[PDB]
Structures are given as C-alpha cells and as structure tokens.
Amino acid sequence: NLCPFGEVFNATRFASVYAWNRKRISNCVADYSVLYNSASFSTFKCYGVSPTKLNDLCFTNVYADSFVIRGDEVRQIAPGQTGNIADYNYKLPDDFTGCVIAWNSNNLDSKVGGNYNYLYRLFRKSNLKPFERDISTEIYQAGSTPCNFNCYFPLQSYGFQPTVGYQPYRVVVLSFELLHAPATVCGPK
Amino acid sequence: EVQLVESGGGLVQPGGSLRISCAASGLTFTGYWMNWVRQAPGKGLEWVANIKEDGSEKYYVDSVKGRFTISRDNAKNSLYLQMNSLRVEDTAVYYCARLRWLRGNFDHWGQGTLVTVSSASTKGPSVFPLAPTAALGCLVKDYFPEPVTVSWNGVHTFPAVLQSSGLYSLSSVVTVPSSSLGTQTYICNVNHKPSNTKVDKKV
Amino acid sequence: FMLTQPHSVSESPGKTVTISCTGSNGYIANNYVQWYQQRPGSVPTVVIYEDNQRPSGVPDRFSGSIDSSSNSASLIISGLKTEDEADYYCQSYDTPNVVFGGGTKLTVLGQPKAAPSVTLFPPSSEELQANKATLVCLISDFYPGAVTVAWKADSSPVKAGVETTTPSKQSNNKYAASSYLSLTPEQWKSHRSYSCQVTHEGSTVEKTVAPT
C-alpha cells in the first residue's frame, strides 16, 4: 500500500493558517523521493533527519499538517522562529523531527479583488505551545479598560492578490513520529 | 574509482555551436539530477543547467536560455549540453556534476572542459627545448586557445601568459641530478588538442 | 535571489575561522546550504552538505551552522591548518535554479619568509634559427605572492617585449610566476648578457645568462 500523500499536496482548498488541518499517515509506504525530487516546491527542508535516509526508515505514524501563508512568512515554519504565525498560528517544537515543504500558490489562491478567505491570528495573550491550534474567536483586549479602548478581533485576512513575499504559499509539515509500538510507515525497502 | 570524463571543448566563433558530453563510470548515473556548471578563467562557479533523472524537465540559467539544450542518455551513462548562438561571456571551463539529491551536495564532478569563444586562429604551439642539481625543460610558444598538457614520460609546469598578440606561451621545468644527464633521456610531450598538435622534444 | 560572501578572510594557524554566506532577496534557510572547497587549479569537492553534515574522509575540523536571524549560513573550520588555504563556495537552490556564492579566498597567516626560486633559460638553439629569441625567467615557491619583475641588458633597463604573469598559487601554498622577454636575435647576440631581476619583500633576486 502507498501513503496517500497525494490527498494532501494536490487537494483543492488548503486550510487557513490558524485552522491548519492535520492528516494522520499510517499503514502505508511512501516514496519520500517522489516528494523532494520535484522542483515544484519553493522550500524543502527537514529537521532532525536527512531526507535521503527517509526511505530507509520506519515511523510509527507520520502527520501531515497543511495551511496557507505568505511567502515571506515561510521562514517561520522552523524550530525556534518568532512571528505572528510562529507565535499565534503554528509552532514547531525546538527539537523537531520532520519536513517542511512549500510552494507558491498564486495561480490558485490569489483573486483579482483579493482572496480574503485565507485568515490568520494577529493577537493572542500568549504564544502557542508546539503543534497547538487556536480557533478562538473572542475579542482580544489590548487595553486596560475592559472591552466587556484598544479592543481588536484576533483574526486578520491576507486578501491575496496577484501583486511574492505577500503571495500565497501552501505549506506542508510532515512530522515523523516514533513510539514504542510497531512502525507502519516505512520507506521503500 | 569513479571518474567523470568529458570531451568536446574547443574554439567556436561567435554565433557558432558546440556540443559537449560527460560520460559516467563507477556510479549509476540514472537516478540522479544531472547538471552543467561553468567557471570562467580567474572567476567563480556559475550553475548552467540541470535535467531530471528521466529527462522530463530541463532548467537553464537566464543568460543561456534558448541558446543551450541539455540532454541525457541513461544507457550510455552520458550527459550532454548543446551550446548554440555562443557569445564571448560564455568562455569558461565547463564542469559536469551530479547532485546527490535535488537540494544537496554535488558528490561527483568531472575534470572539466574549456570552451573558448572569440575570433579565429586555433594557432598551434611551437615547442622548443630549454637545455641545461640542474634544470631542463620545454618552452611552449605562441598558441591558442587553452588547454595545453605537458608530460615527460619533480615536474613544475607554469601557468601561461597571454601576450600582446593575444596568444598564450608556457614554460615547464623539471630538475634532475647532474650525474644522470648522460645516462637518462628526457623528452617532454606537449599536446594542444585544439590544434591537433602532439610534439615530443628531446633535451 | 542571490548570495554574498566576504571577498577574503584570514586567521592564524590553530585558530577557528567562520566564512559567512548571507542571503539577498530571499531566505537562505528556506533550503539546504552546501559548501564546496576548490584548491588552485583543481575541481570543487564537497566539504559541507545539508547545512551541517560532514562527508566521510573530509577533515573533522570542518563544521557548519545556520542563522535564519542574520540570513546567513556559515562554514566553520576548527583548529585551522595551512593546508586549508583554498577558495570556498556556498550554494543553495531556489525552485528553478542552482545558486552559488561569489567565493571566499581563505588565507592562513604567519607562514612567510619564502624567497623566490629563479631558474633562467636563454633562447633555444632551434628558436634562434627561426629568427626569434625569447628569454624565459621562471619564478616559483615564494610567499607572500607579490613580486615585481624587471629586465636588464648589460645592467641597462629593458623597456620592450616584457610579458609577466600574475602570481599564481601552487599546491604547497607558495606562488609561481613567469616572465618572458622577446628579442630579435641581433639584440640578443649583440649585448653582453641579459638579466632577470625579481624584488620580493625588499630583496632583489637576479639571474644573468650570456650568449655563448
């Protein structure tokens, strides 16, 4: 059997970076070399593991998390980064084991008026713990006076237009999970 | 061990075409991305093009676009680069290299071929004996373009100088004990592949 | 997207050097960064791949680091040796093109006092019959690589027909260069002798040859 990675990368609508979707990958085999070899991706970096050895390895599960961000925001999907997406949207652990893959989505996700359906969180009382997801839509109180002065809605929009640093970039995070349980996703052996 | 052997460098006129190949031995050349990356004299590395393992997609740098076509034969374990509409700026030693994975290192490289692009006169060297611990060697005069190989089957061959006429000249010296001059015979082998010149001279 | 490197960097033997590869118009840590050494007149070989992984058989002194904050990938050589003196290149890959740095010329200080080795050859017998004469002054094994070559005929300066090579780095880290003087056979045989004079770190080294 093959890991249905196609379901992830070639899906029609990706999540918004605040409600980032997660798919679990199990009981399958993946040609990881199909992924990295493609010039399609404007980013391919893995942390905690060399991609070539991915094919030699077994993992208890693999998690595919996908969302859309701005190109010049990509630098953040990486351990130890800071920023809106790093702090208020998607947080990778300091010690990561996975791969971060990104491509420009302007042809699909930019509209002429701006595509306002891709959203992000701009304010939060505190930062995300790694792999935490916050869809809370309650008013953010930025002022001493209770909103019940400096009161804001946490979620902004990207409003994507064919302007690349502000262009839509779809992102996939593959985290490689090892448990004391039988590995069910392995490379080609 | 694995050697990557290229051929086909030489002199071409502006607007002319040249074709160069890299042939593999000791590695499976099939499953990898193949690339051409050039380096002009006294200059730095510049990636020129690359090609997918199965030939599906080919990518080139902007300044060669439309002018170069990169191709491969997996059966011969060979990589190819057709250079058309050549310009002076293209003058460079052209290396072939294989990247281990698409964003990784170049684990294997070729020895390099030089393409020179300019006016005419693939003019050959005139090889003269430079006669005598003592030193003896050969003078490689008035040639064009590079490269020249000098052999003797402590040898120090020197880089050439490009004269005011526009042609290179090269010298080469080896040192040997004074006692062995009478007994041993010393001959230098000069090859200027552009001029189909191969000369052996006694000293 | 582009990469900038320091033009030159120097540090003493036994110390540690960092050679930076900082990104313009993009993010360097978006994709892996690879490092390539090129010794004079030799093919590039890998020294660091995948930002910080080290190939087998490459000296243990080579390390790598990445700094997304300063937009730079770094090449580190612990406990330097004189044999590390070579040009170093970083590369990375944007979605459609492989991209290389300008290149870094690494120097290992404190290894000088190498005077120039001169061997001087008179015009060949074959060359004279061809109505030409070229005197060949070959200079090798000197450090630092800065020299001025002047020719004399009868201890009177020569102002014509002199072509001198830019000093070039050898394998043994010294420098080699060649100077050729073009003469008509009459100018050669008429004069007493010709001399080749090399001044290096304030010392003049000269050889004199004579028509026999």
Coordinates of N, CA and C in Angstrom, one line a residue, chain B:
Chain B
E1 N 38.5 3.9 -9.3 CA 37.4 4.7 -8.7 C 36.7 5.4 -9.8
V2 N 35.6 6.1 -9.3 CA 34.7 6.8 -10.3 C 35.4 8.0 -10.9
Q3 N 35.4 8.0 -12.2 CA 35.9 9.1 -13.0 C 34.8 9.6 -13.8
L4 N 34.6 11.0 -13.9 CA 33.7 11.5 -14.8 C 34.5 12.2 -15.9
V5 N 34.3 11.7 -17.1 CA 35.1 12.1 -18.3 C 34.3 12.9 -19.3
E6 N 34.7 14.1 -19.6 CA 34.1 15.0 -20.5 C 35.0 15.1 -21.8
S7 N 34.4 15.5 -22.9 CA 35.1 15.7 -24.1 C 34.4 16.9 -24.8
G8 N 35.0 17.4 -25.9 CA 34.3 18.3 -26.7 C 34.6 19.8 -26.6
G9 N 35.4 20.2 -25.6 CA 35.8 21.6 -25.5 C 36.7 22.1 -26.7
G10 N 36.6 23.3 -27.0 CA 37.4 23.8 -28.1 C 37.1 25.2 -28.4
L11 N 37.5 25.7 -29.6 CA 37.2 27.1 -30.1 C 36.1 27.1 -31.0
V12 N 35.2 28.1 -30.8 CA 34.0 28.3 -31.7 C 33.9 29.8 -31.9
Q13 N 33.4 30.1 -33.1 CA 33.2 31.5 -33.4 C 31.9 32.1 -32.8
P14 N 31.8 33.4 -32.5 CA 30.5 33.9 -32.1 C 29.4 33.6 -33.1
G15 N 28.3 33.1 -32.5 CA 27.1 32.7 -33.3 C 27.2 31.2 -33.6
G16 N 28.3 30.6 -33.3 CA 28.6 29.2 -33.6 C 28.0 28.3 -32.5
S17 N 28.0 27.0 -32.8 CA 27.5 25.9 -32.0 C 28.6 24.9 -31.6
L18 N 28.5 24.4 -30.3 CA 29.4 23.4 -29.8 C 28.6 22.4 -29.0
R19 N 29.0 21.2 -29.0 CA 28.3 20.1 -28.2 C 29.3 19.4 -27.3
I20 N 28.9 19.3 -26.0 CA 29.8 18.7 -25.0 C 29.1 17.6 -24.2
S21 N 29.9 16.5 -23.8 CA 29.4 15.4 -23.2 C 30.2 15.0 -21.9
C22 N 29.5 14.4 -20.9 CA 30.1 13.9 -19.7 C 29.6 12.4 -19.7
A23 N 30.6 11.5 -19.6 CA 30.3 10.1 -19.6 C 30.7 9.5 -18.3
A24 N 29.8 8.6 -17.7 CA 30.0 8.1 -16.4 C 30.5 6.7 -16.3
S25 N 31.3 6.5 -15.2 CA 31.7 5.1 -14.9 C 31.9 5.0 -13.4
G26 N 31.4 3.9 -12.8 CA 31.5 3.6 -11.4 C 30.3 4.1 -10.6
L27 N 29.3 4.7 -11.2 CA 28.1 5.1 -10.4 C 26.9 4.9 -11.3
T28 N 25.8 4.6 -10.7 CA 24.5 4.6 -11.5 C 24.1 6.1 -11.7
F29 N 24.3 6.5 -12.9 CA 24.0 7.9 -13.4 C 22.5 8.2 -13.6
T30 N 21.7 7.1 -13.4 CA 20.3 7.1 -13.8 C 19.4 7.8 -12.8
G31 N 19.6 7.6 -11.5 CA 18.6 8.0 -10.5 C 18.7 9.4 -9.9
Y32 N 19.5 10.2 -10.6 CA 20.0 11.5 -10.0 C 19.7 12.6 -11.0
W33 N 19.9 13.9 -10.4 CA 19.8 15.1 -11.2 C 21.1 15.4 -11.8
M34 N 21.2 15.7 -13.1 CA 22.4 15.9 -13.8 C 22.6 17.4 -14.1
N35 N 23.8 18.0 -13.9 CA 23.9 19.4 -14.1 C 25.2 19.8 -14.8
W36 N 25.1 20.9 -15.5 CA 26.3 21.6 -16.0 C 26.6 22.9 -15.3
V37 N 27.8 23.1 -14.8 CA 28.2 24.3 -14.0 C 29.6 24.7 -14.5
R38 N 29.7 26.0 -15.0 CA 30.9 26.5 -15.6 C 31.6 27.5 -14.7
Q39 N 32.9 27.8 -15.1 CA 33.8 28.7 -14.3 C 34.7 29.3 -15.3
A40 N 34.6 30.6 -15.6 CA 35.5 31.3 -16.4 C 36.9 31.5 -15.8
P41 N 37.9 31.8 -16.6 CA 39.3 31.9 -16.0 C 39.3 33.0 -14.9
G42 N 39.9 32.7 -13.8 CA 40.0 33.6 -12.7 C 38.7 34.1 -12.2
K43 N 37.7 33.2 -12.1 CA 36.3 33.6 -11.8 C 35.7 32.5 -10.9
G44 N 34.5 32.6 -10.6 CA 33.8 31.7 -9.7 C 32.7 30.8 -10.3
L45 N 32.2 29.9 -9.5 CA 31.3 28.9 -10.0 C 29.9 29.5 -10.4
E46 N 29.4 29.1 -11.6 CA 28.1 29.5 -12.0 C 27.3 28.3 -12.6
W47 N 26.2 28.0 -11.9 CA 25.4 26.9 -12.4 C 24.7 27.2 -13.8
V48 N 24.7 26.3 -14.7 CA 24.4 26.5 -16.1 C 23.1 25.8 -16.5
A49 N 22.9 24.5 -16.1 CA 21.6 23.9 -16.3 C 21.5 22.6 -15.6
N50 N 20.3 22.1 -15.5 CA 20.2 20.7 -15.0 C 19.0 20.0 -15.6
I51 N 18.9 18.7 -15.4 CA 18.0 17.8 -16.1 C 17.5 16.7 -15.2
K52 N 16.2 16.4 -15.3 CA 15.7 15.4 -14.3 C 16.2 14.0 -14.7
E53 N 16.0 13.1 -13.7 CA 16.6 11.8 -13.9 C 16.0 11.1 -15.1
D54 N 14.7 11.3 -15.4 CA 14.2 10.6 -16.5 C 14.1 11.5 -17.8
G55 N 14.6 12.8 -17.7 CA 14.5 13.7 -18.8 C 13.3 14.5 -18.9
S56 N 12.3 14.4 -17.9 CA 11.0 15.0 -18.0 C 11.1 16.5 -18.1
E57 N 12.0 17.1 -17.3 CA 12.1 18.6 -17.2 C 13.5 19.0 -17.3
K58 N 13.8 20.1 -17.9 CA 15.1 20.7 -18.1 C 15.0 22.2 -17.7
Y59 N 16.0 22.6 -17.0 CA 16.1 24.0 -16.5 C 17.5 24.6 -16.7
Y60 N 17.5 25.9 -17.2 CA 18.6 26.6 -17.6 C 18.7 28.0 -16.9
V61 N 19.9 28.5 -16.7 CA 20.1 29.9 -16.3 C 19.7 30.9 -17.4
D62 N 19.3 32.1 -17.0 CA 18.6 33.0 -17.9 C 19.5 33.4 -19.1
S63 N 20.8 33.6 -18.9 CA 21.7 34.1 -19.9 C 21.9 33.0 -21.0
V64 N 21.7 31.7 -20.8 CA 21.8 30.7 -21.8 C 20.5 30.3 -22.4
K65 N 19.4 30.8 -21.9 CA 18.1 30.3 -22.4 C 17.9 30.5 -23.9
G66 N 17.4 29.4 -24.5 CA 17.1 29.4 -25.9 C 18.4 29.0 -26.7
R67 N 19.6 29.3 -26.1 CA 20.8 29.0 -26.7 C 21.4 27.6 -26.4
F68 N 21.1 27.1 -25.2 CA 21.7 25.8 -24.8 C 20.5 24.8 -24.7
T69 N 20.8 23.5 -25.1 CA 19.8 22.4 -24.8 C 20.6 21.3 -24.1
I70 N 20.1 20.9 -22.9 CA 20.8 19.9 -22.1 C 20.0 18.6 -22.4
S71 N 20.7 17.5 -22.6 CA 20.1 16.2 -22.9 C 20.9 15.1 -22.1
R72 N 20.3 13.9 -22.0 CA 21.0 12.8 -21.4 C 20.6 11.5 -22.0
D73 N 21.5 10.5 -22.0 CA 21.3 9.1 -22.4 C 21.7 8.3 -21.1
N74 N 20.7 7.7 -20.5 CA 21.0 6.8 -19.4 C 21.7 5.5 -19.8
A75 N 21.4 5.0 -21.0 CA 22.0 3.8 -21.5 C 23.5 3.9 -21.6
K76 N 24.0 5.0 -22.1 CA 25.5 5.3 -22.1 C 26.0 5.8 -20.8
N77 N 25.2 6.1 -19.8 CA 25.5 6.9 -18.6 C 26.2 8.2 -19.1
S78 N 25.6 9.0 -19.9 CA 26.1 10.1 -20.5 C 25.2 11.3 -20.4
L79 N 25.8 12.5 -20.1 CA 25.1 13.8 -20.1 C 25.7 14.7 -21.2
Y80 N 24.8 15.5 -21.7 CA 25.1 16.3 -22.9 C 24.6 17.7 -22.8
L81 N 25.3 18.6 -23.4 CA 25.0 20.1 -23.4 C 25.3 20.7 -24.8
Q82 N 24.2 20.8 -25.6 CA 24.4 21.5 -26.9 C 24.4 23.1 -26.6
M83 N 25.5 23.7 -27.1 CA 25.6 25.2 -26.9 C 25.4 25.8 -28.3
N84 N 24.4 26.6 -28.4 CA 24.2 27.3 -29.7 C 24.4 28.8 -29.5
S85 N 24.3 29.6 -30.6 CA 24.4 31.0 -30.6 C 25.4 31.6 -29.6
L86 N 26.6 30.9 -29.5 CA 27.5 31.2 -28.5 C 28.0 32.7 -28.5
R87 N 28.3 33.2 -27.3 CA 28.7 34.6 -27.1 C 30.0 34.5 -26.3
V88 N 30.8 35.6 -26.2 CA 32.1 35.7 -25.6 C 32.0 35.4 -24.1
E89 N 30.9 35.9 -23.4 CA 30.8 35.8 -22.0 C 30.7 34.3 -21.6
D90 N 30.4 33.4 -22.5 CA 30.2 32.0 -22.2 C 31.6 31.3 -22.0
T91 N 32.7 32.0 -22.4 CA 34.0 31.5 -22.3 C 34.3 31.0 -20.9
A92 N 34.4 29.7 -20.7 CA 34.6 29.2 -19.4 C 35.0 27.7 -19.5
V93 N 35.6 27.2 -18.4 CA 35.8 25.8 -18.2 C 34.4 25.3 -17.8
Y94 N 33.9 24.3 -18.4 CA 32.5 23.8 -18.2 C 32.7 22.4 -17.4
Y95 N 32.2 22.4 -16.2 CA 32.2 21.2 -15.4 C 30.9 20.5 -15.4
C96 N 30.8 19.2 -15.3 CA 29.6 18.5 -15.2 C 29.5 17.9 -13.8
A97 N 28.3 17.9 -13.2 CA 28.3 17.4 -11.8 C 26.9 16.8 -11.5
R98 N 26.9 15.9 -10.5 CA 25.8 15.1 -10.2 C 25.4 15.5 -8.8
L99 N 24.2 16.0 -8.5 CA 23.8 16.3 -7.2 C 23.2 15.0 -6.5
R100 N 23.6 14.7 -5.4 CA 23.1 13.6 -4.6 C 21.6 13.5 -4.5
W101 N 21.0 14.7 -4.1 CA 19.6 14.9 -4.1 C 19.4 16.3 -4.6
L102 N 18.2 16.7 -4.9 CA 17.9 18.0 -5.6 C 18.5 19.2 -4.8
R103 N 18.4 19.3 -3.5 CA 18.9 20.4 -2.7 C 20.2 20.1 -2.1
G104 N 20.8 18.9 -2.3 CA 22.0 18.5 -1.6 C 23.3 18.9 -2.3
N105 N 24.4 18.1 -2.0 CA 25.7 18.4 -2.4 C 25.9 17.8 -3.8
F106 N 26.9 18.3 -4.5 CA 27.5 17.7 -5.7 C 28.5 16.7 -5.2
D107 N 28.1 15.4 -5.2 CA 29.0 14.4 -4.7 C 30.1 13.9 -5.7
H108 N 29.7 14.0 -7.0 CA 30.7 13.6 -8.1 C 30.8 14.7 -9.1
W109 N 32.0 15.0 -9.6 CA 32.3 16.0 -10.6 C 33.2 15.5 -11.7
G110 N 33.1 16.2 -12.9 CA 34.0 15.9 -14.0 C 35.3 16.8 -13.9
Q111 N 36.3 16.4 -14.7 CA 37.6 17.0 -14.7 C 37.6 18.4 -15.4
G112 N 36.6 18.7 -16.2 CA 36.4 19.9 -16.8 C 36.8 20.1 -18.3
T113 N 35.9 20.7 -19.1 CA 36.3 21.1 -20.4 C 36.1 22.6 -20.7
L114 N 37.1 23.2 -21.4 CA 37.2 24.6 -21.7 C 36.6 24.9 -23.0
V115 N 35.6 25.8 -23.1 CA 35.1 26.4 -24.4 C 35.6 27.8 -24.5
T116 N 36.3 28.1 -25.5 CA 36.7 29.5 -25.8 C 35.9 30.0 -27.0
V117 N 35.5 31.3 -26.9 CA 34.6 31.9 -27.9 C 35.3 33.2 -28.2
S118 N 35.7 33.4 -29.4 CA 36.4 34.6 -29.9 C 36.6 34.5 -31.4
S119 N 37.5 35.4 -31.9 CA 37.9 35.4 -33.3 C 38.7 34.1 -33.6
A120 N 39.2 34.1 -34.9 CA 39.7 32.9 -35.5 C 41.1 32.4 -34.9
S121 N 41.8 31.6 -35.7 CA 43.2 31.2 -35.4 C 43.4 30.3 -34.2
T122 N 42.9 29.0 -34.4 CA 43.3 28.0 -33.5 C 44.8 27.7 -33.8
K123 N 45.7 28.6 -33.4 CA 47.1 28.6 -33.8 C 47.8 27.7 -32.8
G124 N 48.6 26.8 -33.3 CA 49.3 25.8 -32.6 C 50.6 26.2 -31.9
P125 N 51.0 25.5 -30.9 CA 52.3 25.8 -30.2 C 53.5 25.4 -31.1
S126 N 54.6 26.2 -30.9 CA 55.9 25.9 -31.3 C 56.7 25.5 -30.1
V127 N 57.1 24.2 -30.0 CA 57.7 23.6 -28.8 C 59.3 23.6 -29.0
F128 N 60.0 24.3 -28.1 CA 61.4 24.5 -28.2 C 62.1 23.9 -27.0
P129 N 63.3 23.3 -27.1 CA 63.9 22.7 -26.0 C 64.7 23.7 -25.2
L130 N 64.5 23.8 -23.9 CA 65.2 24.6 -22.9 C 66.2 23.7 -22.2
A131 N 67.5 23.8 -22.6 CA 68.6 22.9 -22.4 C 69.5 23.4 -21.2
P132 N 70.0 22.5 -20.4 CA 70.9 22.7 -19.3 C 72.3 23.0 -19.7
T133 N 72.6 19.6 -9.0 CA 71.3 19.5 -9.5 C 71.0 20.6 -10.5
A134 N 70.5 20.2 -11.7 CA 70.3 21.1 -12.8 C 68.9 21.0 -13.4
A135 N 68.4 22.0 -14.0 CA 67.1 22.1 -14.5 C 67.0 22.1 -16.0
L136 N 66.0 21.4 -16.6 CA 65.8 21.3 -18.0 C 64.3 21.3 -18.3
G137 N 63.9 21.8 -19.5 CA 62.5 21.9 -19.7 C 62.2 22.4 -21.1
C138 N 61.0 22.6 -21.4 CA 60.4 22.9 -22.7 C 59.7 24.3 -22.7
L139 N 59.7 25.0 -23.8 CA 59.0 26.2 -24.0 C 57.9 26.0 -25.0
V140 N 56.7 26.4 -24.6 CA 55.5 26.2 -25.5 C 55.0 27.5 -25.9
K141 N 55.4 27.9 -27.2 CA 55.3 29.3 -27.7 C 54.0 29.5 -28.5
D142 N 53.5 30.7 -28.5 CA 52.5 31.2 -29.4 C 51.4 30.2 -29.8
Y143 N 50.5 30.0 -28.8 CA 49.4 29.0 -29.0 C 48.1 29.6 -28.7
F144 N 47.0 29.0 -29.1 CA 45.6 29.4 -28.8 C 44.6 28.4 -29.3
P145 N 43.5 28.2 -28.5 CA 43.2 28.6 -27.2 C 43.8 27.5 -26.2
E146 N 43.5 27.7 -25.0 CA 43.8 26.6 -24.0 C 42.9 25.4 -24.1
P147 N 43.2 24.3 -23.5 CA 44.4 24.0 -22.6 C 45.5 23.3 -23.2
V148 N 46.7 23.4 -22.7 CA 47.9 22.6 -23.1 C 48.3 21.7 -22.0
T149 N 48.6 20.4 -22.4 CA 49.1 19.4 -21.5 C 50.5 19.1 -21.8
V150 N 51.4 19.1 -20.8 CA 52.8 18.8 -20.9 C 53.1 17.7 -20.0
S151 N 53.8 16.6 -20.5 CA 54.2 15.4 -19.8 C 55.6 15.1 -20.1
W152 N 56.2 14.1 -19.4 CA 57.6 13.9 -19.5 C 57.9 12.4 -19.6
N153 N 56.9 11.6 -19.5 CA 57.0 10.1 -19.7 C 57.4 9.8 -21.1
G154 N 60.2 15.4 -10.4 CA 59.7 16.7 -9.9 C 59.5 17.7 -11.0
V155 N 58.3 17.6 -11.6 CA 57.9 18.4 -12.8 C 57.1 19.7 -12.3
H156 N 57.5 20.9 -12.7 CA 56.6 22.0 -12.4 C 56.3 22.8 -13.7
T157 N 55.0 22.6 -14.2 CA 54.6 23.3 -15.3 C 54.0 24.6 -14.9
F158 N 54.2 25.7 -15.6 CA 53.8 27.0 -15.1 C 52.6 27.5 -15.8
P159 N 51.7 28.3 -15.2 CA 50.6 28.9 -15.9 C 51.2 29.8 -17.0
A160 N 50.4 29.9 -18.1 CA 50.8 30.6 -19.2 C 50.6 32.1 -19.0
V161 N 51.1 32.9 -20.0 CA 50.9 34.3 -20.0 C 50.2 34.6 -21.4
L162 N 49.2 35.5 -21.4 CA 48.6 35.9 -22.7 C 49.3 37.1 -23.2
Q163 N 49.9 37.0 -24.3 CA 50.8 38.0 -24.8 C 50.0 39.1 -25.5
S164 N 50.7 40.2 -25.9 CA 50.0 41.3 -26.5 C 49.4 40.9 -27.9
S165 N 50.0 39.9 -28.5 CA 49.4 39.4 -29.8 C 48.1 38.7 -29.5
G166 N 47.8 38.3 -28.3 CA 46.7 37.5 -27.9 C 46.8 36.0 -27.8
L167 N 48.1 35.5 -27.9 CA 48.3 34.1 -27.8 C 49.1 33.7 -26.6
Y168 N 48.8 32.5 -26.1 CA 49.5 32.1 -24.8 C 50.9 31.5 -25.1
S169 N 51.7 31.6 -24.1 CA 53.1 31.0 -24.1 C 53.3 30.3 -22.7
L170 N 53.9 29.2 -22.7 CA 54.0 28.4 -21.5 C 55.4 27.8 -21.4
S171 N 55.9 27.6 -20.1 CA 57.2 27.0 -19.9 C 57.0 25.9 -19.0
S172 N 58.0 25.0 -18.9 CA 57.8 23.9 -18.0 C 59.2 23.3 -17.6
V173 N 59.4 23.1 -16.3 CA 60.8 22.7 -15.9 C 60.7 21.5 -15.0
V174 N 61.7 20.7 -15.1 CA 61.9 19.5 -14.2 C 63.4 19.6 -13.7
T175 N 63.7 19.1 -12.6 CA 65.0 19.1 -12.1 C 65.5 17.7 -11.8
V176 N 66.8 17.5 -12.2 CA 67.3 16.1 -12.1 C 68.8 16.1 -11.7
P177 N 69.3 15.1 -11.1 CA 70.7 15.2 -10.7 C 71.7 15.3 -11.8
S178 N 72.8 16.0 -11.6 CA 73.7 16.4 -12.7 C 74.3 15.1 -13.2
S179 N 74.5 14.1 -12.4 CA 75.2 12.8 -12.8 C 74.3 12.1 -13.9
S180 N 73.0 12.2 -13.8 CA 72.1 11.4 -14.7 C 71.9 12.1 -16.0
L181 N 72.5 13.2 -16.3 CA 72.3 13.8 -17.6 C 72.8 12.9 -18.8
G182 N 74.0 12.3 -18.6 CA 74.5 11.5 -19.7 C 73.7 10.2 -19.9
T183 N 73.3 9.6 -18.8 CA 72.7 8.3 -18.9 C 71.2 8.3 -19.3
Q184 N 70.4 9.2 -18.6 CA 69.0 9.2 -18.8 C 68.6 10.2 -19.9
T185 N 67.5 9.8 -20.6 CA 66.9 10.6 -21.7 C 65.6 11.3 -21.2
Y186 N 65.5 12.6 -21.5 CA 64.4 13.4 -21.0 C 63.7 13.9 -22.3
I187 N 62.4 13.6 -22.4 CA 61.6 14.1 -23.5 C 60.2 14.6 -22.9
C188 N 59.8 15.8 -23.4 CA 58.6 16.4 -22.9 C 57.5 16.2 -24.0
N189 N 56.3 15.9 -23.6 CA 55.2 15.6 -24.5 C 54.2 16.8 -24.4
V190 N 54.1 17.6 -25.4 CA 53.2 18.7 -25.5 C 52.0 18.4 -26.3
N191 N 50.8 18.6 -25.8 CA 49.6 18.4 -26.6 C 48.7 19.6 -26.5
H192 N 48.3 20.1 -27.7 CA 47.4 21.2 -27.8 C 46.2 20.7 -28.6
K193 N 45.3 20.1 -27.9 CA 44.1 19.5 -28.5 C 43.4 20.4 -29.6
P194 N 43.2 21.7 -29.3 CA 42.6 22.5 -30.4 C 43.3 22.4 -31.7
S195 N 44.6 22.4 -31.7 CA 45.4 22.4 -33.0 C 45.8 21.1 -33.5
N196 N 45.3 20.0 -32.8 CA 45.7 18.6 -33.2 C 47.2 18.5 -33.2
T197 N 47.9 19.2 -32.3 CA 49.3 19.2 -32.2 C 49.7 18.2 -31.0
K198 N 50.6 17.3 -31.3 CA 51.2 16.4 -30.3 C 52.7 16.4 -30.7
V199 N 53.6 17.0 -29.9 CA 55.0 17.1 -30.2 C 55.9 16.5 -29.0
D200 N 56.9 15.7 -29.4 CA 57.9 15.2 -28.4 C 59.2 15.8 -28.7
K201 N 59.8 16.4 -27.7 CA 61.1 17.1 -27.9 C 62.2 16.6 -26.9
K202 N 63.4 16.2 -27.4 CA 64.5 15.8 -26.6 C 65.2 17.0 -26.1
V203 N 65.8 16.8 -24.9 CA 66.5 17.9 -24.2 C 68.0 17.5 -23.8

